[PDB]
Ligand binder design. Structure first.
Ligand SMILES: [Mg+2]
Ligand SMILES: [Mg+2]
Ligand SMILES: [Mg+2]
Ligand SMILES: [Mg+2]
Ligand SMILES: [Mg+2]
Ligand SMILES: [Mg+2]
Ligand SMILES: [Mg+2]
Ligand SMILES: [Mg+2]
Ligand SMILES: [Mg+2]
Ligand SMILES: [Mg+2]
Ligand SMILES: [Mg+2]
Ligand SMILES: [Mg+2]
Ligand SMILES: [Mg+2]
Ligand SMILES: [Mg+2]
Ligand SMILES: [Mg+2]
Ligand SMILES: [Mg+2]
Ligand SMILES: [Mg+2]
Ligand SMILES: [Mg+2]
Ligand SMILES: [Mg+2]
Ligand SMILES: [Mg+2]
Ligand SMILES: [Mg+2]
Ligand SMILES: [Mg+2]
Ligand SMILES: [Mg+2]
Ligand SMILES: [Mg+2]
Ligand SMILES: [Mg+2]
Ligand SMILES: [Mg+2]
Ligand SMILES: [Mg+2]
Ligand SMILES: [Mg+2]
Ligand SMILES: [Mg+2]
Ligand SMILES: [Mg+2]
Ligand SMILES: [Mg+2]
Ligand SMILES: [Mg+2]
Ligand SMILES: [Mg+2]
Ligand SMILES: [Mg+2]
Ligand SMILES: [Mg+2]
Ligand SMILES: [Mg+2]
Ligand SMILES: [Mg+2]
Ligand SMILES: [Mg+2]
Ligand SMILES: [Mg+2]
Ligand SMILES: [Mg+2]
Ligand SMILES: [Mg+2]
Ligand SMILES: [Mg+2]
Ligand SMILES: [Mg+2]
Ligand SMILES: [Mg+2]
Ligand SMILES: [Mg+2]
Ligand SMILES: [Mg+2]
Ligand SMILES: [Mg+2]
Ligand SMILES: [Mg+2]
Ligand SMILES: [Mg+2]
Ligand SMILES: [Mg+2]
Ligand SMILES: [Mg+2]
Ligand SMILES: [Mg+2]
Ligand SMILES: [Mg+2]
Ligand SMILES: [Mg+2]
Ligand SMILES: [Mg+2]
Ligand SMILES: [Mg+2]
Ligand SMILES: [Mg+2]
Ligand SMILES: [Mg+2]
Ligand SMILES: [Mg+2]
Ligand SMILES: [Mg+2]
Ligand SMILES: [Mg+2]
Ligand SMILES: [Mg+2]
Ligand SMILES: [Mg+2]
Ligand SMILES: [Mg+2]
Ligand SMILES: [Mg+2]
Length: 75
RNA sequence: UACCCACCCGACCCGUCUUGAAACACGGACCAAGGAGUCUAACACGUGCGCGAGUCGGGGGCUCGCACGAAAGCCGCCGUGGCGCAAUGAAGGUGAAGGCCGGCGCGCUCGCCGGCCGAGGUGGGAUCCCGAGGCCUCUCCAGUCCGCCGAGGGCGCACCACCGGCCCGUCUCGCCCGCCGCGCCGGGGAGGUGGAGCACGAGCGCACGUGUUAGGACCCGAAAGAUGGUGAACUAUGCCUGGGCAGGGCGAAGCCAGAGGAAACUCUGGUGGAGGUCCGUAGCGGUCCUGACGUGCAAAUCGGUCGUCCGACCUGGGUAUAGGGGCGAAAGACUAAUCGAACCAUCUAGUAGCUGGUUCCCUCCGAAGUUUCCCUCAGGAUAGCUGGCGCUCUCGCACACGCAGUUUUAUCCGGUAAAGCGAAUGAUUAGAGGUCUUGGGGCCGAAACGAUCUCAACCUAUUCUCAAACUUUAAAUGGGUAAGAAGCCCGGCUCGCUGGCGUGAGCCGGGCGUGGAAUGGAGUGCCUAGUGGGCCACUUUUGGUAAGCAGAACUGGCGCUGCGGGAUGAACCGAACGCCGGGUUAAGGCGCCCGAUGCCGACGCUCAUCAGACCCCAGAAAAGGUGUUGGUUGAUAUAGACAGCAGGACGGUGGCCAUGGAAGUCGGAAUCCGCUAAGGAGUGUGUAACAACUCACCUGCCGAAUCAACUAGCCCUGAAAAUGGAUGGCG
RNA sequence: GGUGGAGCCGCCGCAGGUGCAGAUCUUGGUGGUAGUAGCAAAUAUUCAAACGAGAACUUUGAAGGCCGAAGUGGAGAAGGG
RNA sequence: AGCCUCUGGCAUGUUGGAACAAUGUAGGUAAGGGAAGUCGGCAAGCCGGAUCCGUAACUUCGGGAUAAGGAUUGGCUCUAA
RNA sequence: ACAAAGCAUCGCGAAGGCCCGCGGCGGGUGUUGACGCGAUGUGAUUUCUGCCCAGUGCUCUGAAUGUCAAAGUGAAGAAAUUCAAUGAAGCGCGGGUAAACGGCGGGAGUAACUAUGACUCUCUUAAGGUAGCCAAAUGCCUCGUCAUCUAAUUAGUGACGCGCAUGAAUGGAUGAACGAGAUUCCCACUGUCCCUACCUACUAUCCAGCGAAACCACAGCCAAGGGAACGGGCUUGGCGGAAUCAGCGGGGAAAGAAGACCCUGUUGAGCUUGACUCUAGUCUGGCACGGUGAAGAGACAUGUUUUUUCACUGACCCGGUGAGG
RNA sequence: ACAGUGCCAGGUGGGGAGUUUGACUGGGGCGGUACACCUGUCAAACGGUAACGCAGGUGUCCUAAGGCGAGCUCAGGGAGGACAGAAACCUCCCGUGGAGCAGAAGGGCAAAAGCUCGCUUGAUCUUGAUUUUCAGUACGAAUACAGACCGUGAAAGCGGGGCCUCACGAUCCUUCUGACCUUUUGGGUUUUAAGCAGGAGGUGUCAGAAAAGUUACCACAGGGAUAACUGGCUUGUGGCGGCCAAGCGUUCAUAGCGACGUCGCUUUUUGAUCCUUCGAUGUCGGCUCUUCCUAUCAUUGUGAAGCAGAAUUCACCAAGCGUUGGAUUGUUCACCCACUAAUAGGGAACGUGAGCUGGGUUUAGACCGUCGUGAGACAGGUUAGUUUUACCCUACUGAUGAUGUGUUGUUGCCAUGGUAAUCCUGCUCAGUACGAGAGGAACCGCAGGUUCAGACAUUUGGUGUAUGUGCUUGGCUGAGGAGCCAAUGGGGCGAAGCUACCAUCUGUGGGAUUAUGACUGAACGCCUCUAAGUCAGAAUCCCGCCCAGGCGGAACGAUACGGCAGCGC
RNA sequence: GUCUACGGCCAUACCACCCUGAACGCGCCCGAUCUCGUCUGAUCUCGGAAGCUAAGCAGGGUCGGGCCUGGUUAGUACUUGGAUGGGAGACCGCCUGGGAAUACCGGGUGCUGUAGGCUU
């Protein structure tokens, strides 16, 4: 009662019948695995983006009206 | 079309297990009727229907003697209750909200008080809305109606990716607490981490399908185990009571006479009739023919021959011992044709990873023999491979992104083939060179690196040959990425990390489109059967001598698959099959079987007393062969060769060694001149040695091509096996 | 078309013990084998008559024979009924 | 005992007829040779009753033993006991 | 083969040995008593019965300072408890036993041919195979060597004995009588054979009558080829003429039986023991029924406990009888 | 006051019960462990890959053989230096690693990872993430971080065991440790127990059963997935045969041989292998019988010889016909005796069991030896042990027939099959050839034999149931006579008929050539058996005689008087 | 042209020997009081500035060894695909593509980075 012991014979056929798929990658992949001292900081960076939104909003209208002036000075 | 018959071509018997079945594998004489995936419960997903944060359904109840009813209808019962509506901790238990703004505590990323919004954000997002601009309309212009195209811009479901946030458990760290009590009281924060969680829901009930189980469980199938029972009419013993065993042989004790002797007693002749005694009927048994018979007269009989036949003999009836028990002069014998453990019924449809079977058509899709784990190796589990069900989108609706058993263009990765060993390591030959060192022997030396050798080991330049477990080098095929919108380029915010400043990452806000060739609609989720014995071929390759052997790689097949071809045939060559008419091919073919050369086919090769005749494939080797045909190279030659026929083949010379004979000649050192024309101090014949003969060498005659070694083609030799015989046959 | 003598099918739905070639399948039936193997253990029958539809086989007579009194003879037990 | 017969009992033991092939199964017999046969003298045949003679090794002194080996055997007419 | 007489061990004086039974104050041996019963071994007679008690058994008025439980007693604690002392049988230790199971070895030198070795050295163990016997039914090498028997002998008989692997009641050696026991040889005999022949009966054969069965996919002429690697069928050849009778044993890998061998199965049974887990039975202790009286002693304590011994008779037990002194 | 019974405790207990007695495995058993791991290789340059493929290692060891930090330099060699030499100690020079780094190898390592010192516990406490085997689960092992507490160093840094790749272990259970933890349930306090979180006690069959045998008394489910026959493939081994040629052969390679080497055939040896068969193909020998092969032992014909004759080896055409009788043995095989012309070798399912036999293997009974505590085991012996069925189809042997030929009969032909004869002695040749002598042939003839075919019965023999005829035993017919019965009463002699190397008779001819030897005669102005041509030539082959007579013919005869006929031209 | 300090790539830089170095530096060098370390001020640590390029270092030189690159070896060895190609077989040829390694010949022999000198 001896038997065959191994083979990779038609295996290439099988796992290429559904066509080996390179793993579908999205933008924004998970941060799990990054060192904690990065996250433990970058979460504080993300948590207090809003404190300082007034500067951001007015300074946006500054360049938005300076480039509404830049596109109108071209006109 | 169906009945019978005829013909040409095709054609092996089905089912089955199987790598492979027409099989010298098994089931199958034939025909009828019967005959095998069921019901229940429990999950799971899909699907249909009712209602929907609810929704039932049961048990009850209220309504009938039912005809239809043991139905239907109805009931704050309808929620007692289940399931859902909420999790998380072992548990005490806690328990899903955040944002924002203003005000007040020091805004301290901490604590408290008033107001607003309420499930956060980013990226895709079916997609609706808004729409610049076009596109006409019989005029120039005016202008409201109608749509088509529509760059660009907005909301953005479902879903996916991500970042945040909240609940609980645990940890870390740290702050302030509230006070019906005192704080070994309770309460809040920041950061990480465990969770089957929340983050404005989707369940309940009822059907049907598929799948997995528990059930006898797709049908049939054990050897067994258990509980109760019935048997000694067979046979095994014991007991009780009955019945039976011709005729002969040997001849024991006892006894009687006679005779000896002194006595003990001993002889001789009788009697006598003992014995698990002999022959041998009846009886009981069963040795040998390995006879008869062997679908018998017989589920063990029949003949001849045999054993025993007054005793541990044979028997009849009565009675005792009953199943892990009996009984045994003991063979595991016998116990009612049954015995290494009876028969009967039940538990029982015992269990089976193992055989066998498994019932109508058509249509579409279509495998595996591999992965890890298993008291696993005939089985499962999980991977794959398969199907079904879908969904999410794309846009051939003049207006596409995406992927890929591709290839380019860049760019990394590699240690195999080859190569090398005057590069390492490991082997290894030779010489030259070296008292390298040194030696061990020598020979010439008292001894002496003195001389000359020698061999050993080393090493200085060299040289021969090697390595799968060696490597300076170093391919081919091959493996990664990359070839943009998730991309670039500006502007600005945030940080508890990082730092002289900046880094870096994260965010918000704007600015810009086809980025190599060729192909094609892509993405994603559920259930899930079968399979988990494989086999063959090119190439690579491991054992083995080799195998139709054992074991891998890579692809392809066969299994799962027919057709043309290979005579025949799984697997070779072509080529993959809906049913047909025409054409044309592939691999193969084209004398005849047998479609096609019934070419005025080319050019050659070969004759076999064993011819040769097509990938897999089925037959042969070294070695030969003036058999014939080509070459190759070297020869020879009109100063006349080759061959043929004629003359010489000698002298110096019994040369020297060898004497045993070698004056040329068993053998060898050799070993050259004279006559020269030419004769080798000899090719051989032989002769003890010569001679004699002959051959090289040279001549005489003849008239032009000849000779030798190799090499390859075909045919021959080498070539021997058994029922007659196979290029498929004829030929 | 025929024979047969009393019930039966189409469509829309529901329910099954629902389709057989096979299991050394079950039951029943029937072949080929085949008018074959066979009707061969213990020596043996023959003649005439009777009866009768019918005689190798019954019955009677005659003849030849065997069992041969440890019987194939005459009576019983158990068993049979 | 076997073999033949009276007494008694049967009718060849689930059939008959025609033939004498091969094989058989049962029985028989063989010239010369005699175990050369075969695994082995398997089977068969040699012996066989009685009377008269005769008897070994060995021995547990009982046996061996019917050891072995020889002779005789009818019918008739007598005789003796 | 068993049995057997015989020989031999072994237990046991009856509350006994062996043994049955589910249980009783139950039964067998036992209507018994050591010349009896039960348990084994060898196997008449003759002649013998050798060494070994280390191993495993069995057994022993045998020490149980080894261990060792239930209860029992002691101590701490609040109590479950915990910890102490002690100690039965068997186990450990020590005697005996082989007619219990069984065991009974290996090396060198050395004598005046050679060889062999009386003799002498080590080593080991529990003794190291003694009397005998052997190529035996026991011997691998093996057709051992010699002789005998044959023309010729792996056969037979007889001797030889470093005997793979003989041997003393797991009995050794013998051996008259006996044997449907196993061999070998000789005489006689023979169809066993050279070498077959004929004769008889019953068959078979044919006929009248009567009539089965096993078996059967389809079936039935061969060679070679291929093929699941030995075809009847297929390829290519060879060929083929109705329907049958007696024979016949080449073929149908003929029938008969889901191979008795072998291997697998997480399928069994029978038997074994040093397997695992248990059991009836039996040995020992404790507790209970279990009392009365007597002495006396130790230990602890300053009564308790342990109780040792000797009595008693009411439970209980056995014995006898027609319950008679 | 114990016996004894009732109940608990310890011991003893194959007397009894139940059960187990691994897997892999070129069948299994015994051997190994490829059963968990690790190196180098195999492995075909990514990774990954098999076998009881190689070459090896592990179940460890370390208080430093770890963590830092310094500080140096190793193996080996040369030259020196009192005892001191190939080796102690010192000094200089050379020294890419040729040392060392606990161990197997493989990688890695130089003001190091090596060696020497000083200081030490990063071998500590704690979440996650990832890699490695992978299902992309664990365990093990590892890699990066982060949070604490530290060690070390001026410091940068390094360090959570050992320079890297191996050195290890689930559930349940047990124990230890941790928190003023939780539960211990109607409250409360203490014990006690249960949780929670980490370690340990272990499963080596290493994803983890608590486990000895035997069966020859055996059973069942299966298996040609797995042996023991045959057959295939293969051909080591076995057998048979070539090539080269150093040598043997007095001389001389090749008459006969032939080393060192090398190429093959063969399936009559054994193996390997496991394709076929396990709902069974009857598994050794011998007996009988046929046929076939030639790798020729004899005989016919020949060539060779170290062939004078005789004898004998070598080779060619050749399988026509031969190849025996016995002793031992189960044997195949073997050995001998004896004969012969020779005692060649083989195939046909290792031909042949519905053909035999059953001696050997190989059931159950027994016996010894060895082994085993035992049941039992033993290619160790030994004795006893059932051998079935044919009537079916085919083949074969005989036997009737069959369609055709108008019907019949007679005499015939021949297609095709079959086929048969064989060897020896004696005499003569001749004591001749040859030889020196010893020795010693042949062809032609003649006489016979062996083996084998075909007959046959005159004689000899065998049988004999003419139941022919005598002779006899027992009985039976009253006796004589005549007979009968006793499975053929027994025995003599016996006709016919069958029948025997146990009697007798008969066995027959040509053709074409093989091997071989020759002729003419080329290629190759010679020579050649050959290339074209010819000749002799045999147990061979074919035919003749001999046997059969075809879905093959031939010639000739007679052809239905009839009462009904019917035809032939 | 050049050095010193710290370097990057790590031999075109190494090794062996030969020749030449103005000035700054680098060095040799001179001492052991303090710091520090040794058996030894040899090395290391420290205080120095009398001498010299003797050496390191720099720079050159060698028909130098080594390395680095080309040529040749060679379209050779090997190989992706292909055939009903050859061959008894070993193997070999061709088609479609890719394409090495020695021996043997050439050429080269350190490029630079920052900060400071010197040649003012
Ligand atoms: Mg098979
Ligand atoms: Mg077959
Ligand atoms: Mg089967
Ligand atoms: Mg059981
Ligand atoms: Mg018989
Ligand atoms: Mg018969
Ligand atoms: Mg009868
Ligand atoms: Mg199967
Ligand atoms: Mg490699
Ligand atoms: Mg399977
Ligand atoms: Mg009616
Ligand atoms: Mg129904
Ligand atoms: Mg039906
Ligand atoms: Mg009679
Ligand atoms: Mg009567
Ligand atoms: Mg009769
Ligand atoms: Mg009757
Ligand atoms: Mg005779
Ligand atoms: Mg004989
Ligand atoms: Mg014989
Ligand atoms: Mg006899
Ligand atoms: Mg006698
Ligand atoms: Mg005894
Ligand atoms: Mg004794
Ligand atoms: Mg003892
Ligand atoms: Mg002795
Ligand atoms: Mg004797
Ligand atoms: Mg004999
Ligand atoms: Mg003897
Ligand atoms: Mg017949
Ligand atoms: Mg057969
Ligand atoms: Mg299993
Ligand atoms: Mg069992
Ligand atoms: Mg035990
Ligand atoms: Mg048991
Ligand atoms: Mg196994
Ligand atoms: Mg590869
Ligand atoms: Mg250091
Ligand atoms: Mg840390
Ligand atoms: Mg270390
Ligand atoms: Mg309480
Ligand atoms: Mg046995
Ligand atoms: Mg037995
Ligand atoms: Mg097989
Ligand atoms: Mg075989
Ligand atoms: Mg010579
Ligand atoms: Mg195989
Ligand atoms: Mg059969
Ligand atoms: Mg020949
Ligand atoms: Mg045979
Ligand atoms: Mg046969
Ligand atoms: Mg038979
Ligand atoms: Mg036998
Ligand atoms: Mg036996
Ligand atoms: Mg004995
Ligand atoms: Mg024993
Ligand atoms: Mg003479
Ligand atoms: Mg008379
Ligand atoms: Mg002629
Ligand atoms: Mg000729
Ligand atoms: Mg002629
Ligand atoms: Mg100094
Ligand atoms: Mg200098
Ligand atoms: Mg200088
Ligand atoms: Mg150079």
């Amino acid at each position: 009662a001896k038997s065959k012991n191994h083979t990779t014979h038609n295996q290439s056929r099988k796992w290429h019948r559904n066509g080996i798929k390179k793993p579908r990658s999205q933008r924004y992949e998970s941060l799990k695995g990054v060192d904690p001292k990065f996250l433990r900081n970058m979460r504080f960076a993300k948590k207090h983006n809003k404190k300082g939104l007034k500067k951001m909003q007015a300074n946006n209208a500054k360049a938005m009206s300076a480039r509404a002036e830049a596109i109108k000075a071209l006109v």
